[PDB]
Write a protein that binds this DNA or RNA. Structure first.
Lengths: 213, 213
DNA sequence: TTTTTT
């Protein structure tokens, strides 16, 4: 799917990426580049197939965080990503797994279009670059590096979310997950079990605690 | 409701009770007093209105602990209590909020009879004593005192279960809970949020670990 | 909750 986006490049690579082994040398952008100056950047990422429960609270988290002046960072994926990003508009930054001349995934075109229009989309890839396994992983590192705090509402084991979670730990980005029932959201519960993430037991509280930092 | 139980008195107060600031001077009993010598005593207490979710896992916890030679201690209450006790039979000990000549709650009369027959029921009250606000809270301290570990599958804030959690902490009895969604079990989630309880993220590993010590 | 619990 063609985006018909009119895109350029960032003048400067955000310093957040300096922590990376191989920081992007060039970033392509469409939308509000000033969002990159937001004091509080929060990643919300997770399963492409969230339960009604997780969706419900992903919406509250995104809306309230954006209401309090934070910007939500995600990857525009089906499920958790695109729920969080739509509900954070216009304060949201998407890192694309393809060049900005392409829309991916196709079914998210309306929201992604709105992000291009009122938020910000960034890509490491210049043109005619279709999503490929390595680019999904590559952009995942950018979501984590750019973000100050990482929220994973719901996630399975051995998922991309879990890889991103390990990146968050590597870079000491505070990691929070939604409380989840047994034998569901296995990935996030393992994070809780191993003390690698904190649970969000009260959304308004959680947010005020982030703000007071 | 009269029980028509034939009951006696324990020859003396079990040692576990001597931690209490006001230990029972006498305990009345019906059933198999040999259960008091079981190495591992585990309390399973909680809301009188468990979700299907909490119910299914309470059943597994109770059965598997019994299989592993543990005795399940509870108060024979509607909901979590009686589910665990019935599934722990015959290895279960009930602490009654009333004298043993009465059945409470009446809806549990069938299982309570089975506990008197094949398990053990204890009471601090000799006779003609119906349950009262004070006797539930008194009973709770005996559940906590007798038990080595306390599992609270699901509970509301400011509840009898929470009262028991407070006693568990006071008398250095380790707490454990089931993972619960946001706004379904505020009581147990608060325990998790304050690090006052540990979550059960795998029932089989939970049990094995208990056996280790 | 009348059918009982910080």
């Amino acid at each position: 799917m063609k985006s018909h986006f009119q895109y350029s490049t960032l003048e400067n690579i955000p310093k957040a990426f300096d922590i990376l082994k191989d920081p992007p040398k060039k970033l392509y952008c469409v939308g509000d580049t000033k969002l990159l100056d937001t004091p509080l950047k929060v990643a919300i990422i997770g399963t492409r197939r969230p339960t009604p429960y997780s969706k419900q609270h992903t919406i509250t988290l995104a809306r309230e965080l954006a209401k309090n002046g934070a910007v939500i960072v995600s990857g525009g994926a089906l499920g958790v990503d695109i729920i969080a990003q739509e509900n954070a508009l216009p304060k949201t930054i998407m890192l694309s797994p393809c060049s900005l001349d392409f829309i991916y995934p196709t079914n998210n075109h309306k929201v992604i279009q709105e992000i291009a229009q009122n938020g910000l989309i960034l890509s490491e890839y210049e043109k005619d670059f279709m999503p490929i396994k390595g680019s999904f992983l590559a952009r995942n590192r950018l979501v984590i590096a750019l973000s100050d705090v990482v929220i994973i509402p719901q996630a399975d084991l051995k998922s991309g979310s879990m890889s991103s979670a390990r990146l968050a730990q590597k870079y000491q980005k505070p990691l929070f997950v939604l409380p989840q029932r047994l034998n569901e959201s296995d990935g996030t519960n393992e994070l809780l079990e191993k003390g690698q993430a904190q649970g969000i037991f009260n959304i308004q509280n959680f947010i005020n605690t982030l703000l007071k930092d």
